[PDB]
Amino acid sequence: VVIDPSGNTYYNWLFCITLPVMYNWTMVIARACFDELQSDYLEYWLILDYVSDIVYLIDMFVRTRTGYLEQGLLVKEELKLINKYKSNLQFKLDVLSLIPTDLLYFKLGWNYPEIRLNRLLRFSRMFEFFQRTETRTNYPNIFRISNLVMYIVIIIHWNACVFYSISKAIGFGNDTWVYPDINDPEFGRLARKYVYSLYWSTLTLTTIGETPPPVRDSEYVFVVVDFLIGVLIFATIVGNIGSMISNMNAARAEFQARIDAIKQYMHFRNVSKDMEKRVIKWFDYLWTNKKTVDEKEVLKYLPDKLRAEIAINVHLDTLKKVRIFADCEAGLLVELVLKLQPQVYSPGDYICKKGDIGREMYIIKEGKLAVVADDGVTQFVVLSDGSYFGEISILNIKGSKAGNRRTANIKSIGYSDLFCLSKDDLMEALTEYPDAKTMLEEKGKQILMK
Amino acid sequence: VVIDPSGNTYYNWLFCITLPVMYNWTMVIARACFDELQSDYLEYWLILDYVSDIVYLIDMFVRTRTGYLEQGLLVKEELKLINKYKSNLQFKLDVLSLIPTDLLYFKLGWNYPEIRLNRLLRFSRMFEFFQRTETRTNYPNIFRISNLVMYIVIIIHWNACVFYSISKAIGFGNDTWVYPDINDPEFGRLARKYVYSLYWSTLTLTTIGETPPPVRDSEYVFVVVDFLIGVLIFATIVGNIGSMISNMNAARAEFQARIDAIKQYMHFRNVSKDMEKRVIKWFDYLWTNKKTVDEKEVLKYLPDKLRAEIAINVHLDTLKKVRIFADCEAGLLVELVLKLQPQVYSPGDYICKKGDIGREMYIIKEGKLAVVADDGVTQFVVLSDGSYFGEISILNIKGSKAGNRRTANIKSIGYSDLFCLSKDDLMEALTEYPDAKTMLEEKGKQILMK
Amino acid sequence: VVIDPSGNTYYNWLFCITLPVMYNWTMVIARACFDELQSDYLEYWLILDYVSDIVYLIDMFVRTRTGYLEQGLLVKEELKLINKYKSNLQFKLDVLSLIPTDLLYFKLGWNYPEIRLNRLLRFSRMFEFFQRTETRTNYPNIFRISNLVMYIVIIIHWNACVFYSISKAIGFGNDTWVYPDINDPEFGRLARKYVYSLYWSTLTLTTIGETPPPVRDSEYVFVVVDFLIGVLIFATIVGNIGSMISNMNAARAEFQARIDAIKQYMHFRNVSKDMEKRVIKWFDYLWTNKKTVDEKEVLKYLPDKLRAEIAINVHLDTLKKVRIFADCEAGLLVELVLKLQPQVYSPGDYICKKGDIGREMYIIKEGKLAVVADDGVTQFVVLSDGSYFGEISILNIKGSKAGNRRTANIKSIGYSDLFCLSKDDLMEALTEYPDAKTMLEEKGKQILMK
Amino acid sequence: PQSIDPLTNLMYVLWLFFVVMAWNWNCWLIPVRWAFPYQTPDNIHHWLLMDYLCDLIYFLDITVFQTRLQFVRGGDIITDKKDMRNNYLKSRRFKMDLLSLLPLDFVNPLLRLPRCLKYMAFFEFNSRLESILSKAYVYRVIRTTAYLLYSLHLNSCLYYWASAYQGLGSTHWVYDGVGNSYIRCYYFAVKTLITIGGLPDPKTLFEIVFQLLNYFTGVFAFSVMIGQMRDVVGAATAGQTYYRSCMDSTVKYMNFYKIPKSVQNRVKTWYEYTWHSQGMLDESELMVQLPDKMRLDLAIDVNYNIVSKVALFQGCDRQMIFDMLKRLRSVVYLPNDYVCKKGEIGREMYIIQAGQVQVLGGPDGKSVLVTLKAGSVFGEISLLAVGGGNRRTANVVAHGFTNLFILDKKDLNEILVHYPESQKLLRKKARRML
């Protein structure tokens, strides 16, 4: 065997089949419409055509060898793959694209390469490669812009070829609208022919005009049709690129929209300038360290298994430093990693207050936190990263005062990026391992007796 | 009987009446402005106009026979239908359409066919047919794009007629802006007249220019007004076409935005290459097997009974394969099939694990799941489609060995799509019919002892 | 020390370093392409370049003084800042920018200003200043308009310089497409050269045409590429403008859609005309007084302490008037204001009805309350802003005339906006402050005595 | 009248329309008089009379008319004559109007540019015209069109000023000097801001600079107008687009699983009927956006009277009734569809908001025991049961498209735990019938 379509090997072949398909979509019509392009480089075009046909045979062999999913499992039986490929429309499209029409070279002559206007029917491989690349690549917006620009270039090139063909059918130099006479030394060059056709197609499709007016009825009709194509088909792709470039920074746009909403609220409510400055400073801190993205609303579309694996992988350094789990067997961390809720606190913020009925336990991942006195000046113990706290009020223990209240108050010396484990969710996980329960209770009694 | 508007015969008659309306909106103004088109094919236009008037009369009759929905019920008696039609504005519009203005052909000659502009007041029938066609067809966005392109064609054709009539009023060949002299044999042809008028209409509406500038105040006013129309009306329709094209790929745009957000999150957090490739493989699998669409969001606004009718047909094989459901429940399955939510599991993962709290019951749709002891080196048995598991953690048996915890773990080989049945949803759907549950306690009694 | 990034002095230096980057990104290519611009103002350009290099050196020094955050604490150690700055790519970019290439002026003459193109690599400071401005400005959409306009001006200026360089390489006056001969005193003016190049670039990049057609093949290629780039740029402009417009009308169009939806709901449901009129007047009052925005959705991204003190600052006039806030405890309000949900009531509405079980306690910030009898005419007592009621039903008293019931018919005279506070959340706050609890119960007993 | 309120009293709308016409005359007629020579001494008296009439309208509005508007202060509408005048004096719009009316004697029409500063009256007029008339999107289209026309107007005036500065007929770029002399400059403006092209090329430096700046300004201006038009037509058809998108999403969902055409036709018919009757696809989505008091009042108006009549619900707390109405869900049943089936249990209370249902009885059904109309309530006894111990005695079939408000068990039961007196009263009523 199978090719494993979800694997990297199948994707690597998708690029190797996209090149002949793009060449057939690009240069077959160019050779068909520009006679000098086909005639001058006939050996090169024959070599490229043979290479593309060979890659087409290899692609058909791969599609016979590729494995689909039945009952959720990959199919390794060869005959089943043959039946699945042949029953699909893709086999018919590949066969129709690979009908050998080169024999018509012996009938219609070497100057008719439009007989290969079936080999671009295998656009499905190119579209599949574009769909797979868009998921795989690290720059999806850049790739989407490049793909749509490639579509624009293909459309303009095809319109240039069509305009040159219409000039050829009507006759070069017969009218002011058509391409000038081939006998002209300046306009007889193949490069000049192609680039003036491209210039005319660019003017017509990009709604510029600035072309000689049509003289014949067919010329007027084709100009109307091509301007309608430029207004409808071309300009829609143009607007899509405009929206995609405008929406490259979607997360930044959402963050800025939040900033505008909060600033408009503060301006309407006549909030003091100091508070507005503090809000601006907080949001600058959020944006500078890339804390503006929320993985609760981003990873919620992922499955719970894969989301839990990502949460384990991202925070692998900070949970191993926590002494309440990942110690006896390094297996408890899997259950409570999904229940971690990340919170960010400003400096000078009292995360825990004395006497409050805390409904959660806070696990420090980033930032330095201080155990504060009653006045707010004297700090006893400075808590570094990986140090758990707030575990007294979550569970009641016998022989303790203020079981549902915090024994001490905790403030953040600087910015702290710490998780908060809820009271109810920890009870479900802690009942599995009694040793962790009694260790937590012993530590709580040790810190509560004084 | 009576004609039901929701019936197929009403849609067929809408199609049959739209063609006279489209013919009147296209050809009446063309014959009014291009007089030769009125004179050359008078024996054809008279027959077509009489046929259109006959079909208009038959449509007027149909509207005295079709029913209307009052209190959610269709009216059957003819007298109330006649009164409802005659009391509506549509009867006045139809009467104004079928006013015998063709008798002015005797006074005004055959040269002036613009006496049939009153017959464009049946635009409501054409708009209603276009509205009804959108819901009926399988490709509605494509039809809407085609309808907007048709509206563009109508506007361009009408502008061409207006430009030709204005040139006729000013004088042919008088100026460089107007249509040239008819006595010229190149521009004297009716086809040339209409095609050049369409050329001017297309370039002026699409804001192309590339036309001779106006030289008179009236010409300047018409040119300014027509570019105003092209900016305000034409560009609005083009933007609507772009909007429908965007709505074609709205699901694609949203899913790719989710993928881009997840990848951008994973890019900043420095997630390992294996996890990133696993996420990419999962999303590529979702795209390849067309599992991106979720039935919860799609079927959000539906009645419970209608959603049951939909969901029974989709999941007919699975609920008939399971022994306990659709064989002994006798109506409970209708309640279950709404509460079941689809979920997909990657190969090799553990859907459920020993010692973990179970909040939902799992029903296999198209997956291959196995029962393993600790690690998965050996499998006791494989679970095919329709087999159910995970009901023990939902409800417990009297004298249960374990309470509110999972007895065994199920590993997923291959990509398994399967239903999930939440504990509270199962409680709601199970308290209604306690009778069929005794098989579930029987199975729990058999499997907990071993 | 060190310079904090969040401080205003870092913003000031961002502006003072963006100014030479503004100068370098625009004028360097202009002097490189327009040789008369460099030759005539050589003293001014040398002075400005030396000033820009000095500012670049000071910016490199400031980057060493800029303090990042480790464990959420500002890094005030000089050696750590030096090691952190030099490790980043920005240090390499700053070194490349400040590489001395003015010494190449001796080898290459005074007519080669493009040796300073390495100084364009400090664009990061420019973009950092521009994104810092967008967050802190009070007019974000005006700044976005200015940013987009300046970007378009920069790109048009660069394309004008490219066109002038292409004309210089081809030769002035050799073709009609290139810039005309510089020996002609009208075309030889430097202002004329720059202005016509900018005009050509504006025409090409904003898709207008109105330029002489290309003569050479290279001119055709450059014009096609420039037109395609200009189409993409115009699309980006249109997308940015539409997004900005959508954002501005985000709240207003949503509110108008809500108005249309509620009107259609009332027309469908046969809602009484009095209630319909009252609801339309209610929505008009909400929109005119700008009370349609909600504090929960806008401020949910803020920290809990920051949001709490913002809610204190907005409602500072009414919280001090309440007898429970800033009267005895002076500090209960900071933790209790988060639990207050704002609500609006139309004239004639009933806040509470005698004989109904109490759910929340009401705090008045604006509006007038009637406290009407059962007849609907007489009022026992009028309630003003900053008052509280509805607390004696939710408070539990052993001896009460009415048990857990409202004791009066509260009527809003007109459009009263209140804060509702749930009973259980109040009991969470009341237990921590027994002094606040006792006086509240005493007031309840006193008001229940009569 | 001494006191005038903006919400009603359409004479206020009419006067404010006259003020907007005066402001439009000032905004549109100052640039065409400053640039063009149309302000000839032959008809200078007409221009002076129109300007004096517009100034009279401005003076009347600022002095005698605006001070009569009643305002809300702390939720209370103030009717006193002195208080309205004081709040007007404290208002920003009176300061803007007073800055608009300034005496500039010095005939130059460029001295009346303060009169264009009375723009808040136009925005207020826009707000009320969005309020008074239904289908307000056409007024927004007209307003965006007027903005585009005013931009073209200003560009034409600037172009004529530039042409007169260089001299009419001096070269091809400037206005040549024959014709209406305004439609030509408006043609230049419409071909410049929208950037059609086709205009004569500029020769001199001033002309090239003006053409450059005009094209660059017009690119952003044209983008602004097309964005405003696109936003307006999107907001006008936002509900239609959303309903269509949901409908085709459902259609492609049923087509993906090869669902037979009968079920698909039923779903499409339900979608069409719901969109044509309700005007919206969901009711709870609109309900949750409204305030709690407004949602409760809407619940009381529609069906509190219907709920109050039924005997089982009698004796309840008033808030007990008010809470259940907020949880009634509107469901549309197609014609010839069974709302209730014999042989299956019932847990759903059915309130017929619209349409009629038929109760089926006799041998093998096929007979109408009763035809319950709108406002009839059936299935209430199914609510008060232990759960699964009750059955539908007869088939209930929707005779037509019927809209029913439904309340179901375990949704009423969670309201019972809120009110214990209602809990025990309903338990006593339930055990009394059984």
Ligand SMILES: Nc1nc2c(ncn2[C@@H]2O[C@@H]3COP(=O)(O)O[C@H]3[C@H]2O)c(=O)[nH]1
């Ligand atoms: N009382 C007390 N708490 C400490 C000390 N060191 C760390 N803590 C943590 O600070 C936390 C504050 O909230 P809790 O009382 O819930 O739990 C407390 C402990 O987890 C200490 O020395 N004394």
Ligand SMILES: Nc1nc2c(ncn2[C@@H]2O[C@@H]3COP(=O)(O)O[C@H]3[C@H]2O)c(=O)[nH]1
């Ligand atoms: N314990 C056990 N469970 C099984 C077996 N075969 C299938 N299962 C199912 O696996 C499920 C795992 O979750 P539960 O313990 O809730 O319920 C379990 C059973 O439904 C088996 O042989 N032993």
Ligand SMILES: Nc1nc2c(ncn2[C@@H]2O[C@@H]3COP(=O)(O)O[C@H]3[C@H]2O)c(=O)[nH]1
């Ligand atoms: N009983 C009573 N309550 C009043 C009076 N004036 C104001 N109130 C307040 O109105 C409130 C209505 O709800 P509650 O009965 O809970 O509490 C009531 C009191 O707080 C009064 O004169 N008598």
Ligand SMILES: Nc1nc2c(ncn2[C@@H]2O[C@@H]3COP(=O)(O)O[C@H]3[C@H]2O)c(=O)[nH]1
């Ligand atoms: N069985 C029966 N039901 C009727 C009749 N008339 C009205 N109904 C209503 O039909 C309803 C069907 O469901 P329920 O049994 O809950 O309640 C029934 C009554 O409300 C009748 O004559 N016979």
